[PDB]
């Protein structure tokens, strides 16, 4: 691990709170240079130590300990969590004179959701194959990084111990079939909750499934029923998506084959994501009770 000095940090606001811990904006300075920091102050610190010099992958800048409380230095990713930066592009609702003006729906761009999706992809290659299983894996849990670079995280929700308050059940709405009804998570999972994270990518972080309850999921799921496509999706995502989410789980792609679709993807000059927008345009609907 690399080791922090306690003098080496200027603390900032609390940006996360949990009956397990808090997270606070910092500065730190590391080496030579001075730089931002999110800090949890209470494992996790090997399995970041493993991974996290992945650039799709949060990392740890050091670890401290200080009277009684480890403090776990992360990596700070300025723009938030994909979820809100997803909700936050739909300009129509944040901007609507913005919006109307230039006949769009969301300040970004096809490409740039692809390159999103693209680096979760990398980031959950890299991981499934240092043998690890996420099991929580959603927007939610991506951080969009300097550079708008898409970083895999999680905040500790799966393990009872979250940081920042999400509705219990919610997680049901990204679980693979065989999670949902015996309780198996495995990488082939992963994917079916990546091909929901890659449509909420699409929707502009729509709710999963919004209207429908959980209990209904267990139930239609079986039957072959699947997220529609959205409106503004070419059929080549969609068919990406429903890939994912084939009720065998050795029949989906792997998270490298993903990675292959989505790069093919951005290399054609063709757009993918239709962000404009038309009369009786809606966005896929957020239901806040789903999920607070
Ligand atoms: C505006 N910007 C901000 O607010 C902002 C906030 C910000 O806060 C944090 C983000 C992520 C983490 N930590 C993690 O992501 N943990 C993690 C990753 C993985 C992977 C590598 C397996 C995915 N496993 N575990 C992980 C592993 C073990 C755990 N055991 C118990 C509990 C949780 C655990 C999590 C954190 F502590 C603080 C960072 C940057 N910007």
Same mark, same amino acid.
């Given at each position: 691990?690399?080791?922090?000095?306690?003098?080496?940090?200027?603390?900032?606001?609390?940006?996360?709170?949990?009956?397990?811990?808090?997270?606070?904006?910092?500065?730190?300075?590391?080496?030579?240079?001075?730089?931002? &920091?999110?800090?949890?102050?209470?494992?996790?610190? +090997? *399995?970041?130590?493993?991974? /996290?010099?992945? $650039?799709?992958?949060?990392?740890?800048?050091?670890?401290?300990?200080?009277?009684?409380?480890?403090?776990?230095?992360?990596?700070?990713?300025?723009?938030?969590?994909?979820?809100?930066?997803?909700?936050?592009?739909?300009?129509?609702?944040?901007?609507?004179?913005?919006?109307?003006?230039?006949?769009?729906?969301?300040?970004?761009?096809?490409?740039?959701?692809?390159?999103?999706?693209?680096?979760?992809?990398?980031?959950?290659?890299?991981?499934?194959?240092?043998?690890?299983?996420?099991?929580?894996?959603?927007?939610?849990?991506?951080?969009?990084?300097?550079?708008?670079?898409?970083?895999? &995280?999680?905040?500790?929700?799966?393990?009872?111990? +979250? *940081?920042?308050?999400?509705? /219990?059940?919610? $997680?049901?709405?990204?679980?693979?079939?065989?999670?949902?009804?015996?309780?198996?998570?495995?990488?082939?999972?992963?994917?079916?909750?990546?091909?929901?994270?890659?449509?909420?990518?699409?929707?502009?972080?729509?709710?999963?499934?919004?209207?429908?309850?959980?209990?209904?999921?267990?139930?239609?799921?079986?039957?072959?029923?699947?997220?529609?496509?959205?409106?503004?999706?070419?059929?080549?995502?969609?068919?990406?998506?429903?890939?994912?989410?084939?009720?065998?789980?050795?029949?989906?792609?792997?998270?490298?084959?993903?990675?292959?679709?989505?790069?093919?993807?951005?290399?054609?000059?063709?757009?993918?994501?239709?962000?404009?927008?038309?009369?009786?345009?809606?966005?896929?609907?957020?239901?806040?009770?789903?999920?607070?």
């Amino acid at each position: 691990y690399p080791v922090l000095d306690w003098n080496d940090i200027k603390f900032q606001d609390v940006i996360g709170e949990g009956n397990f811990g808090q997270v606070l904006k910092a500065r730190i300075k590391k080496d030579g240079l001075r730089m931002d &920091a999110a800090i949890k102050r209470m494992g996790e610190l +090997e *399995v970041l130590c493993k991974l /996290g010099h992945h $650039p799709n992958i949060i990392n740890l800048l050091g670890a401290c300990e200080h009277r009684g409380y480890l403090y776990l230095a992360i990596e700070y990713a300025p723009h938030g969590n994909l979820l809100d930066f997803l909700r936050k592009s739909r300009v129509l609702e944040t901007d609507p004179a913005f919006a109307i003006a230039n006949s769009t729906a969301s300040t970004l761009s096809s490409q740039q959701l692809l390159h999103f999706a693209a680096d979760v992809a990398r980031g959950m290659d890299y991981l499934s194959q240092k043998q690890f299983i996420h099991r929580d894996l959603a927007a939610r849990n991506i951080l969009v990084g300097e550079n708008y670079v898409a970083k895999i &995280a999680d905040f500790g929700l799966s393990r009872g111990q +979250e *940081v920042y308050k999400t509705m /219990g059940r919610l $997680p049901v709405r990204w679980m693979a079939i065989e999670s949902l009804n015996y309780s198996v998570y495995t990488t082939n999972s992963d994917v079916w909750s990546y091909g929901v994270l890659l449509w909420e990518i699409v929707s502009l972080g729509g709710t999963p499934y919004c209207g429908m309850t959980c209990a209904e999921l267990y139930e239609k799921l079986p039957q072959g029923y699947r997220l529609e496509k959205p409106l503004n999706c070419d059929d080549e995502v969609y068919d990406l998506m429903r890939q994912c989410w084939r009720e065998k789980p050795y029949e989906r792609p792997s998270f490298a084959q993903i990675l292959v679709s989505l790069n093919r993807m951005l290399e054609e000059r063709k757009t993918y994501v239709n962000t404009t927008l038309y009369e009786k345009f809606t966005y896929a609907g957020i239901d806040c009770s789903a999920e607070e």
